[PDB]
Design a protein around this nucleic acid. Structure first.
Lengths: 78, 280, 267, 78, 280, 267
DNA sequence: TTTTTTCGTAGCTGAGGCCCTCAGCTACGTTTTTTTTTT
DNA sequence: TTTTTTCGTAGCTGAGGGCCTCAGCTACGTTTTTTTTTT
């Protein structure tokens, strides 16, 4: 179990709530939680299945050098 | 479009959350508490094993549905925080698990084996040989009184017995109030575990005939390792409202002892003593 | 046995009685002695006080869809009574008792005695054959093209309209049946014909009455070929359950089915 | 050393860059890093000293029950 | 208003980052790489011990200033990734540390003590007694020939000696290319460490007279535990561009071995052997 | 030690020579043999090739502010040459040698021999006395209200204009002195009068020339009482350093100071 | 055989635009299938 | 002694507004102090 952050942008209400099932929304489209790898993967298929037109970045704590990894859905300048 | 919503493993969850005085609704498919002034508070319902509803809460149909969908148990608690009612998915139980449990409970010899295992797990030594279930019950009761006495003298708490008045919470003393609240928390996470594992809370081995018999059985095994000593520690301080301090303490204990992670293997281990081959 | 359906309002307590309240004031007054079971339909809200009262008197709260077409959540989860569960379990675990119960189910469903020389596993083929014949007759009767029962458990849109309708209909039936089983105090997972599934008993009981009411309606609506046939079927099943008192009739049937084991029932 | 997330809203460019000294900006005003307690505190005094009119939430990984804590600067509905 | 910008501890940092082909600028007080197409890449410069600048980079005055301010060493690397130049805060050194190191280096007996400590840390056993610095040099060199031979035999790499051609990188072996790049990485983090601890890279004990003498001294103690074996492993595969694979491997080694956290205590431990009271 | 100040442009290599490049093409051509040290002022950009070349020929790169009023970064950090550092260190570590060097510093600063019966710590009080006297004389000369030197190391705004100006001025002086010390190959941290601080030697050397140029201009500007007095002082110090060649004159002075130890200098 | 002001970066400001939030309205109680290949 | 439509929530849409980004311009090379209490 490691820390997870999901940042959403221009996503439909149903994904906004769906994430609120497992994670705490600390800002608009900014959700925080502590989950296992497989729950993280679960949350990611929720994201890919509901984000539609919007875009999302998901970052989590790892044992890699920088201490975290992240993946994205949709496109974004960053 | 639409994606199914499934429960996450019990061990991966925060143990419990206490809600009071507000209406619980669903907003855009999320669990939400709203207070008298309009302030919305969002509850990660899928991340909790147990949600405790205190007086003044009003729960919508959609919310109860949601809680059941994510496999979070709703527990309604009263005065001194005692469990009063619970809500969950009815179709959650598994045939092989239920029939396994039933087969173990219906057979007096298998039942005796399970009871003996509970005893050994609880007291750290085997029960004296060729003793019936009732004789074991008497031995257990004796040891439990001894434990209450010991805890009372260690924490320097006056102990006049386990007593409460069903008609007035103010009639019981503080230590018993604390024990009741603490035990309530434990029974909450235990019922959640038993249900998640696919078993029936009502089918017990030491305790029988009650709707929560198996819960009593399982909880009693670890009850004095964890929760009751802290009930005494809190009682010694004589706080104004011991309930919230007890709840906080029980949360911390469940986290540090990894109770949620231990409960299902405990159940399986207990049932395994019947020496009937387990489901899967 | 006695129950009430509540919708669109808050369930509260006034003077030791259950009460349904809307903006128009008190909508329904319920004395504590008059219901064993309260079915909460969509649009309802439960107060803490009401739950406290239900706990005091032993009233089962069930969160259902309209007319019980879905069962969403239940108080006393995993079942309130040990004796009921252990009774059902004993009947399911003993092959002779199980056979007796299955024979009773056959009799209730088809109106004729089950053949004596066949085991439960053997009774299955017969039941399946009769189901094939019944689907055929209904298809000819309502003038619907039928080449058999075909559905994809993983994809709803692959079926033709008739199979889609049948699926929606049985879904509702599983709803009220599960509700009935819960009200009667038994476990949906302990079955006799169907085993191993979380709703095995529900399937068992529902199969008994499935072709009287609900499936014919699937065919009638399929024949009518409406815009949203699944939704029309659900609504029609709702109306049927209300007007025919399906839930109330299911409970004595469940008790009768189990009583066929010829073991002393719980008090 | 634990995972750190900083979410900024309406802060001057100098804070936007200052955070970029230690943390990775994965979205506009969303920064991720892995830092020690004392560095987290240093970053917080940077925030309090430069955020001015804007508002900021800082969340980090802990061994508490929820697995994270968070504190805020300025006002925000959440 | 404005707040001062200070270096974070070396152990709290990512070890190194490689930059190539783009202009490095400061935008709103942040380190940024911009490539030929306009793509801006942000570098958390304060979170790194070393920024390695490859050919085709062009660094602004502001960027060099910033790197020095946060205490990040800039290292310019050439072909086969050999260190070529470095940039850092000139006023970074601490007088007590510098004078301590100088005192240890200027005194031949103290110097001998420090060299002996380096030997023991490097080989896991004490050096033979009453040996001068040069004799120890010879023993060390002999053991190193043995280590190269052994590594070559284990990883099955043809070894014809440590050879490189200063005028052409293509003249060297693949294995020597790898060793050079690996060692380069090690010297990067080592120079960063020595500077951060407040010491002078040019004042060494085994190696003397060179601008990086102390770096050679310290790195040599751990180079054969960590980087050189990995260099043989990569050389064995005969890769196309062995540099990037070597650089990544060294990053992983530094993380898994926690090299950054170990380097400063190693330096202090080495100097402490002079038995003159340490500073701080 | 020859050197060059480069500003506003990219430093690159053409045909084995250093080159400064504008939008206008080549601004300054630098043969590799003609400079030991390149001082990079604000607005400059260094190519990898330029650093590569500098490394080949042993050229020191120093990143400074205008005219070296600040030293930001340095190549060969921690010093290029062992012999220079060990020479300086040896002089600082030996109390007899240290005393000789301090006496030389006193002589260069005040133009008269240091009193012989005093130790370094004792020479100190004398220096302080003369500094107080010099500040007073300058104050009366430029007609500035002076009640002594007062500054708060943690707060710049609490001081009056004259002390603010003096601080800005010395700050610039510390810039060129540190640049000089780096160009000469010595360590800013190893001092003789001042000890224990990261820039101890810088303080030592700067004190020698501090009252010739820079502090008087601090007083002149303070008297003029401009809008941004600190910024005017920095600019003025920049112009002084450029026109009077302060950095180039500092290096022989540094060598002269250290030579007083009467120990053989590095080649 | 001079009169060579040129580079990098921060602050400010207005235009543009993305998107977050909510009020007001309409619609709906629903995401289904349980040993399937008819007669 | 009947003709009792009532509650909770999602989708849609337009208005409002907050803020992120960048172009175009102007300004500037800077965040300082080193054993302080004058003569």
């Amino acid at each position: 179990m490691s820390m997870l952050v999901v940042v959403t942008e221009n996503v439909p209400p149903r994904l906004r709530g769906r994430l609120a099932i497992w994670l705490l929304e600390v800002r608009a489209g900014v959700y925080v939680g502590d989950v296992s790898a497989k729950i993280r993967e679960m949350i990611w298929e929720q994201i890919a299945g509901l984000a539609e037109e919007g875009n999302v970045v998901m970052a989590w704590a790892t044992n890699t050098e920088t201490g975290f990894e992240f993946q994205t859905f949709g496109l974004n300048r960053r | 479009t639409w994606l199914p919503l499934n429960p996450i493993p019990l061990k991966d969850r925060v143990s419990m959350i206490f809600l009071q005085y507000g209406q619980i609704d669903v907003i855009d498919g999320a669990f939400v508490l709203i207070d008298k002034t309009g302030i919305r508070t969002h509850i990660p319902v899928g991340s909790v094993a147990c949600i405790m509803l205190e007086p003044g809460t009003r729960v919508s149909h959609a919310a109860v549905r949601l809680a059941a969908q994510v496999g979070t148990l709703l527990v309604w608690v009263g005065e001194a925080g005692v469990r009063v009612y619970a809500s969950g998915q009815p179709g959650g139980a598994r045939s092989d698990k239920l029939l396994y449990q039933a087969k173990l409970a219906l057979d007096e010899d298998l039942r005796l084996k399970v009871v003996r295992k509970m005893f050994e797990l609880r007291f750290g030594e085997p029960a004296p040989a060729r003793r019936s279930v009732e004789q074991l019950r008497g031995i257990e009761g004796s040891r439990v009184r001894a434990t209450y006495a010991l805890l009372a003298k260690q924490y320097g708490v006056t102990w006049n017995g386990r007593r409460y008045d069903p008609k007035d919470w103010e009639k019981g003393d503080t230590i018993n109030q604390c024990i009741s609240a603490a035990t309530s928390c434990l029974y909450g996470v235990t019922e959640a575990a038993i249900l998640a594992a696919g078993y029936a809370p009502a089918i017990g081995f030491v305790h029988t005939g009650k709707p929560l018999s198996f819960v009593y059985d399982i909880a009693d095994i670890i009850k004095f390792d964890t929760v009751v000593p802290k009930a005494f520690e809190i009682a010694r301080r004589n706080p104004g409202e011991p309930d919230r301090e007890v709840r906080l303490a029980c949360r911390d204990i469940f986290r540090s002892s990894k109770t949620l992670a231990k409960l299902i293997p405990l159940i399986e281990d207990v049932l395994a003593a019947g020496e009937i081959q387990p489901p899967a």
